[PDB]
Amino acid sequence: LSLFSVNDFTCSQISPAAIASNCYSSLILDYFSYPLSMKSDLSVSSAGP
């Protein structure tokens, strides 16, 4: 969070504080280039392209 300003912070089916506090059996981090304008198009589940 310090390295990159967070334009949108959302967690689905989980709490951000909870993930940090609880030890994780596995951690997957995904980085991809994405346009700032299409905030709605990016979703955990959507009918969007």
Binding site: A18, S21, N22, C23
Partner: protein
């Protein structure tokens, strides 16, 4: 079934008896199905420990 439902007392002398009601005796009422709890657990507030 013994672990999470009913456990007999080791210290007191105990007898375990399994019996089936006769057709003639209608006083008993049959349950819809036999039901037992397979597991019982408590999740801690942290959620990392159960």
């Amino acid at each position: 079934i013994s672990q999470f439902n009913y456990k007999q007392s080791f210290s007191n002398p105990t007898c375990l008896i399994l019996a089936t009601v006769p057709h003639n005796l209608t006083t008993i009422t049959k349950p819809l199905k036999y039901s037992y709890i397979n597991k019982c657990s408590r999740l801690l507030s942290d959620d990392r420990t159960e």
